Ligand binder design. Structure first.
Ligand SMILES: Nc1ncnc2c1ncn2[C@@H]1O[C@H](COS(=O)(=O)NC(=O)[C@@H](N)CO)[C@@H](O)[C@H]1O
Ligand SMILES: Nc1ncnc2c1ncn2[C@@H]1O[C@H](COS(=O)(=O)NC(=O)[C@@H](N)CO)[C@@H](O)[C@H]1O
Lengths: 461, 319
RNA sequence: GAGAAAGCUCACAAGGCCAUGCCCCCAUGUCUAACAACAUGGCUUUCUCACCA
């Protein structure tokens, strides 16, 4: 029914068991209860005492097991050394040998009997403990999405002589986007890009990639298929009744999932590996298709599959460095959107929506005139202590010590939201859509016109 | 298996040929170590020069096709079962090349094996104006294959579950001659791309698959493999995708008729990576970059990466 | 991709694709004072029957 894949991974021995944060806030229960309540994750403060008590019991059982193990090792080494000297029948007859053998047998029986109980305790405690969320930054406002503070807004809504139309209607008029009578082939909420739209998407992805490459980001490509354990480590729910991640049929393949985002793939690539101190900070830019079940009635606002460039980087051990890297990522997002020219406001995300694996999150919403409301297109999340601990990502220092490394993940741009914002923002009464200067060279045309080719005719019964 | 054309010259190497995987691991561009749990089996990760090579090849092919007027297009990743049945691929059989989404979670949802199925779905149950024909559109999307043979060369980059493959789809008029010439043009374009890259290659003709009336397979010489490797497959079809999907085109007279369909594969990143790395392989392991891709890569000569390679601290390691 | 077998795989000497040394798996458990030895399973290799849209 329900079982974590990280505990199963550690049990089989594929990877080292993750180090939880319960010890960090175990000192003061009230501070942790208040922070957890503000985050309002799946776990609640009401159930926290049970988890802390079980963890303490687990520590005591492990200490007892260690003591028994030490005694067994000492008796085995002493008996082996004594047996080597004067290895004759008389030594065997000696009472010391018989007593040591009996003690070894008793210790072995005690340890084997204790092992199952300890394993059950560990499974139950780790299962409940995984739900616990990450630390909340003090400067993060507490409340609902509306409560989120606005850091600043760049640009202004464009003045329009006439009411701008919806992006879907403009696309159908220009035939760039076709969403009619697609239930039989691609299912609901499936979209198609044609003509200028496809070129616009490719130009945006290439422009973002070139901009990031010049800054020194190392390009990376991640496989779409991923196993469930990586998903659990990322913090998403791989399996749930309302789960939104697509899982392939079990009979054909087992434990195969479609990547929710490129960052998940990069994290899997970095799982169970170390990085040299000189390389830090390491920035990797990955572009890949993301399929979300996502379980508006019409339009491109909700789409099952889309292409989004994602920048994920592993920073130094110091928390200050992770924050500085997040700030640099935010600056990059601002430069990209200013160059494109869209009106975007960067608002700090509230504690309630921060999520299980994100310490500090910045949400950038771009004004859409046709839609009439800001749409969130860029999200930056500081995975400093949750993802590294879950996947054991560590950075070795010059001395040779291993220190966990903070991870920051952000989305440079999304083709559906940026396409909708650009179309609605630059739409005109004649129906032509102006092209921003950055994408003009890639597209090669300042504006778009009605398609020359005759649009398709529906012959379906 | 007749050889219609042979182009280029086999490279001469003083030292023994080196496998693409060995060069990639030494260069660190591609890593395939202990990725069973993280990414499944026979997957791959491209970093550094490798990622630039994949993007460069896709962008270069896309720009070349666009210059000739190909209409760029994109297709939905998720496709219905009926579309696959129409294209001649059946998922009912237990061993199938089509990934099947869980039925309980979603109903009749299957990943697109190739981009051709998506483009064919696009033209389903629609009539194209007799003036628009011929219509050539280039779609670029990732293709996932359910089964890759592991009996021979399992630990290789030649066959992979997920690969980036540019696909060119062209609808043509009722005349068979129009379809044949369109296929000829597609073959010329792919041959031109390969010649531009400089890979030695031979194009042959497959006898008689059943759905395709004619077929053309282009194989590129690989030094590491030591044998010719198929890199592209353009295969004509005659009144089969349309007669199965009920795709009809209205002529000037107005009579309903079924148009011919031509589908070709411009290029695949994994095979091209193998050929490019092995053909330009040097004595010190450095890989020369062809001038055509120099602008995209931006590096005249690839060298060992400055960043230190990642070490494995996992339990499954000898101690 | 399917089935089955084995325990190691990478590298350095040396001969005209492999003869020998150099090194000879990670875990959970049954009898053992304990290494080892046999099971289940993972991973790295090898041998088979089959699709490559
Ligand atoms: N139903 C949806 N359909 C298509 N695109 C979406 C959808 N929801 C969000 N997006 C786009 O995808 C972006 C990612 O936002 S997010 O999934 O909630 N967070 C992430 O993906 C993290 N990996 C950030 O690096 C959004 O900012 C938006 O641009
Ligand atoms: N198992 C595979 N793994 C990775 N790439 C493949 C694989 N099989 C074929 N390709 C790539 O796709 C090309 C076409 O081979 S094919 O997929 O079986 N046939 C087709 O794609 C045609 N139906 C339209 O493209 C090959 O030349 C190669 O570039």
């Amino acid at each position: 029914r329900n079982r974590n894949l990280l505990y199963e991974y550690a049990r089989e021995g594929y990877s080292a068991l993750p180090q939880l944060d319960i010890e960090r806030f175990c000192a003061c229960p009230e501070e942790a209860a208040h922070a957890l309540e503000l985050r309002k994750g799946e776990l609640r403060s009401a159930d926290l005492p049970a988890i802390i008590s079980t963890w303490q019991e687990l520590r005591q059982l492990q200490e007892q097991i260690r003591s028994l193990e030490e005694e067994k090792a000492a008796v085995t080494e002493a008996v082996r050394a004594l047996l080597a000297n004067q290895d004759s029948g008389e030594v065997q007859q000696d009472p010391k040998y018989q007593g040591l053998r009996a003690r070894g047998r008793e210790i072995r029986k005690e340890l084997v009997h204790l092992y199952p109980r300890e394993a059950q305790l560990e499974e139950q405690f780790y299962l409940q403990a995984l739900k616990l969320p990450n630390q909340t930054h003090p400067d993060v406002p507490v409340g609902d999405e509306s409560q989120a503070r606005v850091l600043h807004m760049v640009g202004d809504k464009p003045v329009f002589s006439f009411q701008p139309r919806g992006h879907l209607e403009i696309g159908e008029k220009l035939d760039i986007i076709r969403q009619k009578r697609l239930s039989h082939v691609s299912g609901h909420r499936s979209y198609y890009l044609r003509g200028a739209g496809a070129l616009l998407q490719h130009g945006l992805v290439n422009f973002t990639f070139n901009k990031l490459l010049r800054r020194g980001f190392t390009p990376m490509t991640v496989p779409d298929l991923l196993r469930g354990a990586v998903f659990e480590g990322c913090g998403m729910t791989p399996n749930a009744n309302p789960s939104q991640i697509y899982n392939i049929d079990p009979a054909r393949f087992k434990d195969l999932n479609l990547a929710g985002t490129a960052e998940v793939g990069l994290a899997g690539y970095f799982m169970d590996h170390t990085v040299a101190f000189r390389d830090l900070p390491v920035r990797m830019v990955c572009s890949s298709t993301c399929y979300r079940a996502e379980t508006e009635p019409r339009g491109l606002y909700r789409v099952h599959h889309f292409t989004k460039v994602e920048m994920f980087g592993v920073t130094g051990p110091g928390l200050e460095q992770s924050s500085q890297l997040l700030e640099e990522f935010l600056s990059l997002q601002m430069e990209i959107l200013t160059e494109l020219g869209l009106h975007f406001r960067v608002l700090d995300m509230p504690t309630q929506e921060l999520g299980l694996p994100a310490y500090r999150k910045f949400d950038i919403e771009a004004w859409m005139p046709g839609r009439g409301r800001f749409g969130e297109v860029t999200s930056a999340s500081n995975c400093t202590d949750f993802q590294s601990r879950r996947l054991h990502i560590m950075f070795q220092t010059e001395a040779g010590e291993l220190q966990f490394a903070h991870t920051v993940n952000a989305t440079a741009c999304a083709v559906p939201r940026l396409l909708i914002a650009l179309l609605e923002s630059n739409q005109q009464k004649d129906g032509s859509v102006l092209v921003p200067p950055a994408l003009q060279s890639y597209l090669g045309t300042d504006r778009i016109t009605a398609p020359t080719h005759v649009p398709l005719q529906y012959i379906g019964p | 298996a007749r050889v219609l054309h042979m182009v280029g010259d086999k490279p001469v190497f003083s030292f023994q040929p080196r496998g693409h995987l060995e060069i990639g691991e030494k260069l660190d561009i591609i890593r395939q170590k202990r990725l069973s749990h993280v990414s499944g089996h026979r997957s791959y990760y491209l970093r550094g020069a490798g990622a630039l090579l994949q993007h460069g090849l896709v962008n270069f092919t896309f720009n070349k096709l666009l210059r000739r007027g190909f209409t760029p297009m994109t297709v939905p990743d998720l496709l219905r079962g009926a579309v696959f049945e129409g294209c001649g691929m059946t998922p009912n059989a237990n061993p199938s090349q089509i990934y099947n989404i869980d039925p309980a979670r979603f109903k009749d949802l299957n990943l697109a094996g190739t981009a051709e199925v998506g483009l064919a779905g696009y033209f389903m149950d629609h009539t194209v104006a007799f003036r628009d024909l011929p219509v050539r559109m280039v779609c670029s999307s990732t293709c996932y294959r359910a089964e890759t043979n592991t009996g021979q060369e399992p630990r290789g980059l030649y066959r992979v579950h997920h690969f980036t493959k540019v696909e060119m789809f062209g609808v043509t008029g009722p005349g068979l001659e129009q379809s044949s010439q369109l296929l000829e043009e597609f073959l010329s374009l792919q041959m031109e791309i390969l010649t531009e890259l400089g890979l030695h290659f031979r194009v042959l003709d497959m006898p008689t698959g059943l759905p395709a009336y004619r077929k053309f397979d282009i194989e590129a010489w690989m030094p590491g493999r030591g044998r010719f490797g198929e890199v592209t497959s353009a295969s004509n079809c005659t009144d089969f995708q349309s007669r199965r999907l009920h795709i009809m085109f209205q002529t000037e007279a107005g009579e309903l008729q079924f148009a011919h369909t031509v589908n070709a594969t411009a290029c695949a990143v994994p095979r091209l990576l193998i050929a490019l790395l092995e053909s330009n392989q040097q004595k010190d392991g450095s890989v020369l970059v062809p001038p055509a891709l120099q602008s995209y890569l931006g590096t005249d000569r690839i060298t060992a990466p400055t960043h230190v390679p990642l070490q494995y601290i996992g339990p499954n390691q000898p101690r």
